[PDB]
Amino acid sequence: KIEEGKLVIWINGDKGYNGLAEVGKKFEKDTGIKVTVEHPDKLEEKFPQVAATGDGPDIIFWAHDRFGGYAQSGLLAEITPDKAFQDKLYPFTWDAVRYNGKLIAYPIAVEALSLIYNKDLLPNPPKTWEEIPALDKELKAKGKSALMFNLQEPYFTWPLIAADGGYAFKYKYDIKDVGVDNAGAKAGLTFLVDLIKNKHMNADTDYSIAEAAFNKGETAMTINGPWAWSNIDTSAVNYGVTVLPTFKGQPSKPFVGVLSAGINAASPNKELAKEFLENYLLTDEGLEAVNKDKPLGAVALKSYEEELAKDPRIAATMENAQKGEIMPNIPQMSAFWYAVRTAVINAASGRQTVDEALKDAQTGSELYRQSLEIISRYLREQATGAADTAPMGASGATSRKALETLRRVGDGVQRNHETAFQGMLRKLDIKNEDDVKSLSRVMIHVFSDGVTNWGRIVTLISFGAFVAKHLKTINQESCIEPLAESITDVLVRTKRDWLVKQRGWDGFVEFFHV
Ligand SMILES: Cc1c(-c2c(-c3ccc(F)o3)sc3ncnc(O[C@H](Cc4ccccc4OCc4ccnn4CC(F)(F)F)C(=O)O)c23)ccc(OCCN2CCN(C)CC2)c1Cl
Numbered sequence: 194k195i196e197e198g199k200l201v202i203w204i205n206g207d208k209g210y211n212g213l214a215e216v217g218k219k220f221e222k223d224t225g226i227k228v229t230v231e232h233p234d235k236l237e238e239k240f241p242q243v244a245a246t247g248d249g250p251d252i253i254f255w256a257h258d259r260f261g262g263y264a265q266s267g268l269l270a271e272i273t274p275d276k277a278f279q280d281k282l283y284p285f286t287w288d289a290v291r292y293n294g295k296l297i298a299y300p301i302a303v304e305a306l307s308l309i310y311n312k313d314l315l316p317n318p319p320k321t322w323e324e325i326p327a328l329d330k331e332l333k334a335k336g337k338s339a340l341m342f343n344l345q346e347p348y349f350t351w352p353l354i355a356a357d358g359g360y361a362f363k364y365k366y367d368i369k370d371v372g373v374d375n376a377g378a379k380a381g382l383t384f385l386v387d388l389i390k391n392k393h394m395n396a397d398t399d400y401s402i403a404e405a406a407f408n409k410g411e412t413a414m415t416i417n418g419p420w421a422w423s424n425i426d427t428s429a430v431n432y433g434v435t436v437l438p439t440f441k442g443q444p445s446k447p448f449v450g451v452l453s454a455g456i457n458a459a460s461p462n463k464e465l466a467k468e469f470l471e472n473y474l475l476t477d478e479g480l481e482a483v484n485k486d487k488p489l490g491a492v493a494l495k496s497y498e499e500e501l502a503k504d505p506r507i508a509a510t511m512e513n514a515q516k517g518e519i520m521p522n523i524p525q526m527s528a529f530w531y532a533v534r535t536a537v538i539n540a541a542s543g544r545q546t547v548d549e550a551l552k553d554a555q556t557g558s559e560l561y562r563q564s565l566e567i568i569s570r571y572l573r574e575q576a577t578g579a580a581d582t583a584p585m586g587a588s589g590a591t592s593r594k595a596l597e598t599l600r601r602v603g604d605g606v607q608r609n610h611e612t613a614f615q616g617m618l619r620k621l622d623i624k625n626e627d628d629v630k631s632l633s634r635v636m637i638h639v640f641s642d643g644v645t646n647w648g649r650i651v652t653l654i655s656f657g658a659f660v661a662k663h664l665k666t667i668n669q670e671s672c673i674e675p676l677a678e679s680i681t682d683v684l685v686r687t688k689r690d691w692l693v694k695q696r697g698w699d700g701f702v703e704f705f706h707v
């Protein structure tokens with residue numbers, strides 16, 4: 194579907210997209226190739242849906258956290274710049290776009306949130322979150338407020354949640370160990386909800402409202418990234434960019450992003466995109482053009498980062514970055530974020546308590562790994578006749594009981610529905626690893642095309658088991674794990690909210706309990 198002889202680029206609407214379009218023009222000048230820059234809404238959700246069908250842009254810009262998902266689904270070209278080009282960027286930026294040992298995007302700029310304050314209202318900004326309520330009472334007596342920032346996107350609230358011990362995935366990354374509902378995270382989120390309760394903040398505040406309030410001098414502080422600074426310059430607010438406040442004596446820990454540019458695997462213009470990015474964008478003049486539209490942060494390109502490093506707003510961005518953590522790029526980042534977005538919104542609005550919101554968030558963040566664990570073990574033990582000896586790990590009680598439940602219910606389905614299982618198995622002609630990939634697409638669609646309950650879920654998994662037995666029979670045992678990942682993937686993507694609403698696999702256990 195993608196058109197040859199041209200470049201289509203997607204980038205978020207808070208970045209310097211007119212600036213990018215000028216770098217575009219310059220590429221056209223030399224090559225005769227038109228460059229179109231677009232900034233559609235929800236482009237990070239839209240890219241994977243459209244790229245899957247071989248559609249979408251040639252180039253997508255986003256922070257690096259999303260790109261492992263994209264690579265895992267096969268949606269990105271492996272980029273292989275030569276050593277001379279690699280040496281022009283900071284190795285840590287290349288690290289942020291490395292997935293399964295392969296480079297999967299070009300890094301552009303490092304982004305962290307800072308505290309932005311209005312110096313005419315607050316000559317000295319607060320060192321602690323704890324002093325903010327009193328500061329707010331003080332500012333409200335003069336018709337102003339202390340702080341406003343986007344409470345609709347968990348990226349802005351995370352530095353506080355993480356300050357006293359909240360984490361996504363532990364310290365490689367242990368995907369088994371999630372810290373979304375530990376006491377640290379509870380305390381950070383509770384402090385936020387109290388802010389709202391006591392009228393220091395409003396749960397409906399979003400990007401635009403916080404931006405408008407700060408940029409007209411109604412609120413003394415916001416929380417935002419470098420991209421925001423241009424609009425504040427335009428507004429004549431006398432602002433500073435500084436270190437985020439501490440919570441319970443500990444630094445606020447923002448999740449640091451590396452703005453990154455990946456090339457669509459379905460693109461017929463890969464040499465053009467590589468040439469654009471390496472030799473027009475990632476140059477002193479290319480990045481300047483973008484930075485002057487909307488500041489990029491600390492750019493990946495060493496030569497231009499040296500000029501920008503002198504700016505104290507960059508120094509403050511790097512100081513907040515140093516106290517935070519580089520985002521993981523693992524495929525589960527998307528589910529983590531979706532879960533935490535929901536938890537913050539619901540806690541803030543009062544729809545759930547902090548305990549309920551973060552419990553649900555934890556379940557959602559663990560859902561993939563846990564489902565895979567159960568599903569994978571079932572298919573393998575069914576195929577070989579023997580259980581996996583290794584420990585279940587964290588949430589092991591749930592996993593173990595789900596597996597025992599599934600053994601009872603799934604064996605019953607296979608036994609009672611042998612005929613049809615044999616029938617559809619026999620129809621499909623599973624002989625190789627290629628034919629197994631085919632199978633998924635069918636299961637993918639047969640599952641998705643129907644209602645939602647545990648019987649249909651058991652049925653999907655049991656058929657998986659039935660196929661697994663076959664695959665061992667014909668010495669294709671290597672294909673069982675990919676079958677399990679595939680089944681798990683349809684299950685947790687299409688059924689996420691229903692699964693969370695059931696208390697995940699504890700609900701499966703209860704529903705089929707004798
Ligand atoms: C495996 C299969 C699926 C199926 C998939 C498939 C096909 C291929 C492929 F890759 O993937 S993925 C998938 N995911 C969820 N469901 C599926 O099926 C059920 C219906 C069902 C079917 C067979 C057994 C039990 C079935 O339900 C039992 C059920 C549902 C609710 N509660 N309980 C009771 C319980 F709680 F106890 F489970 C559903 O959609 O509701 C499926 C769908 C239909 C099937 O046979 C149709 C009959 N042709 C057989 C072949 N012949 C040549 C033509 C006729 C067959 Cl075999």
Ligand SMILES: OC[C@H]1O[C@H](O[C@H]2[C@H](O)[C@@H](O)[C@@H](O)O[C@@H]2CO)[C@H](O)[C@@H](O)[C@@H]1O
Pocket residue numbers: 205207237256257258259304346347348349418450530
């Ligand atoms: O809100 C969760 C969101 O956080 C990050 O998105 C940031 C992005 O990194 C920044 O470049 C800037 O545009 O603001 C976004 C927040 O609205 C993650 O990168 C993203 O994947 C996640 O959903």
